[PDB]
Design a protein around this ligand. Structure first.
Ligand SMILES: *[C@@H]1O[C@H](CO)[C@@H](O[C@@H]2O[C@H](CO)[C@@H](O[C@@H]3O[C@H](CO[C@H]4O[C@H](CO[C@H]5O[C@H](CO)[C@@H](O)[C@H](O)[C@@H]5O[C@H]5O[C@H](CO)[C@@H](O)[C@H](O)[C@@H]5O)[C@@H](O)[C@H](O[C@H]5O[C@H](CO)[C@@H](O)[C@H](O)[C@@H]5O)[C@@H]4O)[C@@H](O)[C@H](O[C@H]4O[C@H](CO)[C@@H](O)[C@H](O)[C@@H]4O[C@H]4O[C@H](CO)[C@@H](O)[C@H](O)[C@@H]4O[C@H]4O[C@H](CO)[C@@H](O)[C@H](O)[C@@H]4O)[C@@H]3O)[C@H](O)[C@H]2NC(C)=O)[C@H](O)[C@H]1NC(C)=O
Ligand SMILES: *[C@@H]1O[C@H](CO)[C@@H](O[C@@H]2O[C@H](CO)[C@@H](O[C@@H]3O[C@H](CO)[C@@H](O)[C@H](O)[C@@H]3O)[C@H](O)[C@H]2NC(C)=O)[C@H](O)[C@H]1NC(C)=O
Ligand SMILES: *[C@@H]1O[C@H](CO)[C@@H](O[C@@H]2O[C@H](CO)[C@@H](O)[C@H](O)[C@H]2NC(C)=O)[C@H](O)[C@H]1NC(C)=O
Ligand code: R5R
Ligand code: R5R
Lengths: 193, 333, 104, 80, 106
């Protein structure tokens, strides 16, 4: 929150804090209309603005906000994890139930697309990719890999059923462990920031 | 005070209704502009926001004064007492000055009668975006201004080499566009009330394809590959294949509908629409491939298997080829 | 508002080139077919007043709507016919296809 | 369940904590997901002794309504 | 309570060359760090008010800088008059001074 004088330069009007700068911006204890943010504190500074019309005093205040994650957890991360697990459970399913596994895969992928598109609209249309975007992308990759695994099982079955059994049994434990490793890595690399 | 006496003398017998040199020669106004920020460029309303510090300098013979004070530095209190040019922005949907805590206006008067008058403005300028090539489209659209009631014979505007300067450009609100640069222009425009000197500043904006990539290009590609995954499925499970195809089609259709909504409803096709329609054709072609296979298996299964393998080996190559063609075509031109 | 036809009379200054810029106008969804300038007097209980009317004819650009709405409709109702080519023995495929077309 | 939750989400603002309607919606989604898992489980032991799969199905047929009713009683007594 | 650690505690650097005094703050004190000069048996004299602003009638060899917690005072060329104790203090909060560093020639 920068403010200063229009039309009066440092040589004519200067600004200063009434009391100690640390105690000069006071926030009412009960006054907080933030919903998804937490106000950690405020910081003040005084400086100069260099302008074609002269040098002006600018008084600066910074309000430090840390975003609350509960809503985003509930609306994106827990749904995404649940969709991943819903795609995973197909491995325990019967191989002979080809329509069942196909329905699971296609519905899960559609569900990941709808969560992706619904999660992107909440934040502004920035060009770069956010952390939630990476989480959504990796979850999408996991569900899509589960679909590819089912496709490979259905391709092998009736030709090399031993290979189909081996690949399905291996995936049953490879996918959950990889998802857990990715979850731990992501949460560590972002929360501890 | 001395300045009080000077200001009293200046305003005595002063008619702010009449411009300087009314019956003599056009009043030459020099204009500068500090582009504080170029706000969001929303194409739905076909406009963009810009925050500027507009400065205007002219000479007023009536404001000459002899004293050791070389410049009278004043606040907005005097803005309405002296004559001020009636500059307005011709392509502004809506603009307003700033009024907190007081009017954000400055006024400086020199010995020789020169007047400098700056103010802070935010303008919702309107410029038509030719959304062909979107979201690869590049735009360069203006902020025009002129005197409302004074034709060229009475008010003339003139730029300066360093008239238009830009801020840091990192805090600007442009998310899907990048500020390539700006150029200025002056011309005369014929109007019902006469000819007016119209001054223009063009801001060249290049779109960022990064966001729309994530929004639409990746999802459409991955739905297309989802449609591909049908071919490797066993031919026997008809409900499996039908459900996969229809789910891909529905997701593709809803994705197309939502993706277009990001764009103003225009009657012409955009580069974005073409890629989406190509992916939609690809999924429809996969559905038709499975349907033809289902009809042809009854007559003979060997041909069905042969054509299924051919489709499996072809479709990815066809999609890659069309991607290359589209991307090169719309990046070159 | 306050002046009747005994006090004020309106007319178009030129009567043909009184309204300008209609050709240069551009709309995302409409095309201006033409415009008309009308002069008349409207009577209220308070008196009679001069009325000018400027009217535009706007025609909707169908091109957007065709692809946006009709094309998904045309397709969906075409795929709905695929059920015919499938043998009636396979109930699941045909039923799913028809019913999902209805949902779409 | 997903669509009902999306319709609820659009109306309300972004709030960190969890609302009562949110608790009910998680409960109901848990029930649906558990039914799906039960179906997958009975399918898994389908090739094995079908008697066990039938017994599991019979257990579910009576427990799921009962457990859902108990959950409804608890939820509605807590919030009233 | 912001604690201003001032180092080095003393200096015996040769006359005529550059002197660098570095003052560090425990917490954020935006630009409210000042440098005072205290010649022996005499009251302190203000040299730098705010960060990187010189007080009236101060030799131009003195110049300071610093943003959040790292502030320094630089002398272009020492003089016989510069043999004094220098203290850095912050005024962002209730004032606290640094330990002060003595300047010596040899
Ligand atoms: C249909 O009806 C509509 C509704 O009535 C009508 O709109 C109104 O039009 C009038 C006239 O056009 C407007 O009045 C003018 O307002 C100008 C500023 O406009 C902005 O601000 C006002 C709000 O005004 C408050 O805040 C301003 C900002 O500082 C103050 O200047 C005001 O005093 C006032 O402050 C009070 O209110 C505060 C909070 O409400 C309080 O906290 C505070 O304590 C005060 O009590 C807004 O309403 C405007 O918004 C509207 O307009 C914009 C236009 O783009 C729209 O976009 C928007 O949507 C809104 O519609 C806008 O934001 C004033 O500058 C102006 O007054 C000057 O000019 C007149 C004319 O000459 C003088 O009489 C007057 O004295 C002023 O001149 C002095 O001041 C200037 C500095 O500005 C000096 O340069 C000058 O030399 C002169 O100084 C001398 O006199 C001084 C005495 O004032 C003295 O102190 C000096 O020492 C010196 O001697 C004028 O008042 C009105 O705001 C519109 N309202 C609305 C709602 O639109 C519309 O036009 C009608 N349509 C038609 C077709 O007729
Ligand atoms: C849009 O709607 C308006 C209003 O309905 C149309 O204006 C109408 O224009 C016709 C032709 O100019 C008018 O007819 C005239 O009536 C007078 C009455 O004395 C007669 O003397 C003339 O010979 C002529 O027949 C009609 O009055 C007028 N409507 C109203 C309410 O004034 C307009 O044509 C429509 N289209 C466009 C493109 O504006
Ligand atoms: C802004 O307008 C000024 C004045 O019209 C332009 O200044 C000219 O700059 C060129 C350099 O390319 C010089 O050769 C001319 O002599 C300048 N003219 C004057 C009158 O000084 C300036 O180029 C414009 N900036 C743009 C278009 O970006
Ligand atoms: C053509 C022109 C150029 C600059 C100004 C101007 N006048 C001021 C007065 C005060 C303050 C804080 C900023 N001002 C600015 C803009 C500026 O220089 N910024 C933002 C760094 C006005 C007109
Ligand atoms: C408050 C709330 C409730 C439910 C959801 C939700 N939406 C989905 C969509 C899809 C899939 C697979 C799972 N979903 C879940 C699961 C969930 O969040 N649980 C179990 C706590 C989101 C927010």
């Amino acid at each position: 929150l920068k403010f200063g004088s229009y039309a009066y330069t440092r040589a004519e009007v200067v600004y200063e804090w009434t009391r100690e700068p640390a105690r000069s911006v006071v926030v009412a204890e009960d006054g907080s209309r933030l919903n998804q943010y937490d106000l950690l504190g405020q910081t003040v500074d005084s400086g100069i603005v260099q302008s074609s019309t002269g040098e002006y005093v600018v008084m600066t205040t910074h309000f430090h906000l840390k975003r609350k994650i509960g809503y985003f957890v509930i609306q994106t991360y827990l749904p995404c994890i649940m969709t991943v697990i819903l795609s995973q459970v197909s491995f325990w399913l019967n191989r002979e139930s080809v329509p069942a596994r196909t329905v699971f895969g296609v519905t899960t992928v559609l569900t990941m697309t709808t969560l992706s598109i619904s999660a992107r609209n909440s934040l502004p249309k920035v060009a770069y990719a956010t952390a939630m975007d990476w989480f959504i992308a990796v979850c999408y990759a996991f569900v899509f890999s589960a679909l590819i695994e089912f496709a490979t099982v259905n391709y092998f079955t009736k030709s090399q059923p031993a290979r189909a059994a081996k690949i399905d049994r291996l995936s049953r434990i490879a996918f959950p462990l990889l998802f857990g490793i990715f979850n731990l890595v992501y949460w560590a690399t972002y929360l501890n920031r | 005070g001395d300045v009080t006496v000077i200001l009293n003398n200046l305003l005595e017998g002063y008619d702010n209704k009449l411009r300087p040199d009314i019956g003599v020669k056009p009043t030459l106004i020099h204009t500068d502009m500090y582009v504080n920020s170029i706000g969001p460029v929303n194409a739905i309303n076909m406009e963009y926001t810009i925050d500027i510090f507009f400065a205007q300098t002219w000479y007023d013979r009536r404001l000459k004064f002899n004293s050791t004070i070389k410049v009278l530095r004043l606040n907005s209190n005097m803005v309405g007492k002296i004559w001020i040019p009636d500059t307005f922005f011709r392509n502004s949907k809506k603009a307003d000055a700033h009024w907190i805590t007081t009017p954000n206006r400055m006024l400086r008067i020199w010995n020789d009668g020169r007047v400098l008058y700056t103010l802070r403005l935010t303008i919702d300028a309107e410029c038509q975006l030719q959304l062909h090539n979107f979201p690869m489209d590049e735009h360069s659209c203006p902020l025009e201004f002129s005197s409302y009631g004074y034709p060229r014979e009475e008010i003339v505007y003139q730029w300066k080499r360093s008239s238009v300067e830009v801020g840091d450009t990192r805090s600007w609100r442009l998310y899907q566009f990048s500020f390539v640069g700006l150029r200025n222009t002056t011309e005369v425009v014929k109007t019902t009330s006469g000819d007016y000197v119209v001054m223009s500043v063009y801001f060249d904006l290049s779109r960022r394809m990064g966001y729309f990539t994530i929004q639409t290009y990746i999802p459409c590609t991955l739905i297309v590959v989802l449609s591909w995954v049908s071919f490797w499925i066993n031919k026997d499970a008809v409900p499996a294949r039908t459900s996969l195809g229809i789910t891909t089609v529905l997701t593709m259709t809803t994705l197309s509908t939502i993706a277009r909504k990001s764009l103003p409803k225009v009657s012409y096709v955009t580069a974005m629409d073409l890629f989406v329609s190509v992916c939609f054709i690809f999924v429809f072609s996969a559905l038709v491939e499975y349907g033809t296979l289902h009809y042809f298996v009854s007559s003979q299964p060997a041909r069905a298997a042969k054509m299924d393998s051919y489709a499996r080996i072809f479709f990815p190559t066809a999609f890659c080829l069309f991607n290359l063609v589209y991307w090169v075509s719309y990046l070159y031109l | 508002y306050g002046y009747t036809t005994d006090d004020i009379e309106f007319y178009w200054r030129g009567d043909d080139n009184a309204v300008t810029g209609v050709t240069k106008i551009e709309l995302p969804q409409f095309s201006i077919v033409d415009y008309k300038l009308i002069t008349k007097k409207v009577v209220f209980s308070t008196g009679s007043y001069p009325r000018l009317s400027l009217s535009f004819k706007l025609k909707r650009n169908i091109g957007y709507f065709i692809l946006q709405t009709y094309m998904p409709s045309i397709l969906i109702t075409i795929l709905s016919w695929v059920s015919f080519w499938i043998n009636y023995d396979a109930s699941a495929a045909r039923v799913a296809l028809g019913i999902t077309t209805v949902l779409t | 369940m997903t669509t009902i939750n999306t319709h609820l989400r659009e109306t309300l603002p972004k709030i960190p904590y969890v609302k009562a309607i949110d608790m009910y919606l998680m409960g109901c989604f848990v029930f649906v997901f558990m039914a799906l898992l039960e179906y997958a489980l009975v399918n898994y032991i389908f090739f094995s002794q079908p008697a066990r799969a039938a017994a599991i199905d019979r257990w579910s047929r009576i427990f799921f309504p009962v457990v859902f009713s108990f959950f409804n009683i608890v939820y509605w007594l807590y919030y009233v | 309570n912001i604690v201003m650690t001032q180092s080095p505690k003393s200096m015996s650097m040769s006359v005529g060359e550059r002197v660098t005094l570095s003052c560090k703050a425990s917490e954020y004190v935006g630009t409210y760090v000042s440098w005072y000069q205290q010649k022996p048996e005499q009251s302190p004299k203000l040299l730098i008010y705010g960060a990187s602003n010189r007080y009236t009638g101060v030799p131009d060899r003195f110049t300071g800088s610093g943003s959040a917690t790292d502030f320094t005072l630089t002398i272009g060329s020492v003089q016989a008059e510069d043999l004094a104790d220098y203290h850095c203090g912050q005024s962002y909060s209730y004032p606290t001074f640094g330990a002060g560093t003595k300047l010596e020639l040899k």
